[PDB]
Curated annotation (Swiss-Prot), chain A:
Its main location: virion. The gene is M. It is a peripheral membrane protein. It comes from Vesicular stomatitis Indiana virus (strain 85CLB South America). This is Matrix protein. Forms a double layer around the helical nucleocapsid, the inner matrix layer binding to the N helix and the outer matrix layer binding to the envelope glycoprotein. Plays a major role in assembly and budding of virion, by recruiting cellular partners of the ESCRT complexes that play a key role in releasing the budding particle from the host membrane. Condensates the ribonucleocapsid core during virus assembly. It is found in: Virion; Host endomembrane system; Host nucleus membrane; Host nucleus.
From Swiss-Prot, chain B:
It comes from the Eukaryota. The gene is NUP98. Residues 1-54 are annotated as: GLEBS. This is Nuclear pore complex protein Nup98.
UniProtKB/Swiss-Prot annotation, chain C:
It is found in: Cytoplasm; Nucleus; Cytoplasm, Cytoskeleton, Spindle pole; Nucleus envelope. This is mRNA export factor RAE1. Gene3D superfamilies: YVTN repeat-like/Quinoprotein amine dehydrogenase. Interacts with NUMA1 (via N-terminal end of the coiled-coil domain); this interaction promotes spindle formation in mitosis. Interacts with NUP98. Interacts with MYCBP2. Interacts with USP11. (Microbial infection) Interacts with SARS coronavirus-2/SARS-CoV-2 ORF6 protein; the interaction displaces RAE1 from the nuclear envelope and impairs its role in nucleocytoplasmic transport. Belongs to the WD repeat rae1 family. Acts as a mRNA export factor involved in nucleocytoplasmic transport. Plays a role in mitotic bipolar spindle formation. May function in attaching cytoplasmic mRNPs to the cytoskeleton both directly or indirectly. It holds the Pfam family WD40. PANTHER family: MRNA EXPORT FACTOR AND BUB3. GO terms for molecular function: microtubule binding; RNA binding; ubiquitin binding. The gene is RAE1. It comes from Homo sapiens.
């Protein structure tokens, strides 16, 4: 015989560069973060974009909303810019190679007592550089407790953190 | 505490390869069960031994 | 395949052959009857019952000192004993707050010690003459299995914890790995590179699967892989726990043993199965090789993989020996 080595749960890693520009125009000021998450998570409805990149954007969208600062002018406006290089473990099989081609997303939302628009601009591409990079879970201030699993889920991210090592992106949900 | 809940093998799917195919699985290990998943065989066994429930 | 004279009353947890610094071969076995037994294995295949020791609870792991004079025993009774074989006298060298799962000998140029791994979520280091630990290490969970080859140690914990250690000077955490396996960790074995250095490990889950993991490989994405094993088989395929795992100390190929009552030999470089045995009357609970790897020990016992119900206190527990250095050669 020859070993059966096929594994759809193979824990592959990713190294990448990323950019996040996010603007959220809203009718009134957000009460909780939970509300922001809802509005921002609409970004992907009617998704036009790179199939193999969709999971990563969810992470950046999540990261976006984590940093959104209010523009004092505008009728409320929120803005965030996030940039860096990171290392991400996941269980999603062979990722196609990612090239620096910014992709554009702009859509509306109507939930609870809030209606408006989310504008998102995102880049993700391979980093062949052998130099060390921090886990993407480190660009989140709040990835230091289990509540984090809940928050990630609002963006369709299913994350694990076991007895050793960082959070691992186990899978991605698209609906709900 | 111990192996009081009867053994019932969890089921699932898996692939099988260069002759690629699809199957069904029966996991023949008690700790695969949701009830016991937090312990190890030697843990359970010891709990059974002290309970004298051999 | 050849039996062993006067094998244990209850199930066998561990096996360990003597180091090369001892003339001839000597086997050690620990059981859930609380006892440890020592045989001398002769070339002839015959085995002479030599000596015995007692714990006040089941014995979970055994191992030898580098120089052959000592056997170290790990038990549920929350202690580890050191056993001087010449005088058949044993003494206590370790204590934990819970059962001791793993026991190893560390022989480092700088220093020498015993490393105990326990379900009290710690790793402890003992010089064998004092009663204080000389070094205590916190683990993220209950210690489930471990292996040692200087200057590297791997430890697997509950909740799929996986940790690598460096042993130069004082032992310290080297890397906290995110486990390649998605099911409970069961057993691990450190493998070497061609230049004979600690270079990786093999990890076995309960889900009929082993992971091959290189510490520092040119391309992790292909070099680090996982393979299915111990699975019987239109019908549903039966999945069994890998209970033990040992490398050939000379050839670099490995032995795996499962709940299904089979052993298998594998070539991890060629990624090829070599041999899968006959199914036995009960699971194979423990296994290993003699100092040079001519003899492959393996015990047939109930591993409790189906709960208290399928335990038949009456069935014999066998240990088998297989004079097979020829069966374990790559091509």
């Amino acid at each position: 015989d020859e070993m059966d080595t096929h594994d759809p749960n193979q824990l592959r890693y990713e190294k990448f560069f990323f950019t996040v520009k996010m603007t959220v125009r809203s009718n009134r000021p957000f009460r909780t973060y939970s509300d922001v998450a809802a509005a921002v998570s609409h970004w992907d409805h009617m998704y036009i974009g790179m199939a193999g990149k969709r999971p990563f954007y969810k992470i950046l969208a999540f990261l976006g909303s984590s940093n959104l600062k209010a523009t004092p002018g505008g009728q409320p406006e929120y803005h965030a810019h996030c940039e860096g290089r990171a290392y991400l473990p996941h269980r999603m099989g062979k990722t196609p190679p990612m090239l620096n081609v910014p992709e554009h997303f702009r859509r509306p939302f109507n939930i609870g007592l809030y209606k408006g628009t989310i504008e998102l601009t995102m880049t993700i591409y391979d980093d062949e550089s052998l130099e060390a990079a921090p886990m993407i879970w480190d660009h989140f201030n709040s990835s230091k407790f289990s509540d984090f699993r809940e928050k990630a889920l609002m963006f369709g991210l299913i994350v694990e953190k076991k007895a050793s090592g960082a959070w691992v992106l186990d899978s991605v949900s698209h609906f709900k | 505490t111990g192996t009081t809940i009867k053994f019932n093998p969890p089921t699932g799917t898996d692939t099988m390869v260069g002759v690629s195919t699809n199957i069904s699985t029966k996991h023949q290990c008690i700790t695969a069960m949701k009830e016991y998943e937090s312990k190890s065989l030697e843990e359970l066994r010891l709990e059974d031994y002290q309970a004298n429930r051999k | 395949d050849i039996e062993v004279t006067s094998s244990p009353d209850d199930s066998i947890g561990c096996l360990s052959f003597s180091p090369p610094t001892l003339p001839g071969n000597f086997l050690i076995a620990g059981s859930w009857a609380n006892d440890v037994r020592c045989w001398e294995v002769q070339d002839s295949g015959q085995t002479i019952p030599k000596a015995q020791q007692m714990h006040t609870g089941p014995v979970l792991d055994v191992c030898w000192s580098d120089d052959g004079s000592k056997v170290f025993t790990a038990s549920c009774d929350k202690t580890a004993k050191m056993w001087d074989l010449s005088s058949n006298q044993a003494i206590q060298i370790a204590q934990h707050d819970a059962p001791v799962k793993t026991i190893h000998w560390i022989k480092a140029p700088n220093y020498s010690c015993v490393m105990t791994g326990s379900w009290d979520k710690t790793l402890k280091f003992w010089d064998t003459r004092s009663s204080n630990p000389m070094m205590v290490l916190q683990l993220p969970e209950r210690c489930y299995c471990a292996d040692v080859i200087y200057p590297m140690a791997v430890v697997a914990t509950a909740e799929r914890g996986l940790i690598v250690y460096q042993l130069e000077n004082q032992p310290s955490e080297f890397r906290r790995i995110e486990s390649p396996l998605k099911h409970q960790h069961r057993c691990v074995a450190i493998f070497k590179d061609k230049q004979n250095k600690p270079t990786g490990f093999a990890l076995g889950s309960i889900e009929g699967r082993v992971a091959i993991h290189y510490i520092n490989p040119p391309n992790p994405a292909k070099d680090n892989f996982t393979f299915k094993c111990h699975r019987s088989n239109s019908a549903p395929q039966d999945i069994y726990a890998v209970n033990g795992i040992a490398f050939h100390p000379v050839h670099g190929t490995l032995a795996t043993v499962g709940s299904d009552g089979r052993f298998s030999f594998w070539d991890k470089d060629a990624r090829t199965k070599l041999k899968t045995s006959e199914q036995l009357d009960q699971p194979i609970s423990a296994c290993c090789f003699n100092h040079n790897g001519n003899i492959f020990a393996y015990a047939s016992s109930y591993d409790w993989s189906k709960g208290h119900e399928f335990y038949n206190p009456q069935k014999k527990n066998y240990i088998f020996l297989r004079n097979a250095a020829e069966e374990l050669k790559p091509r």
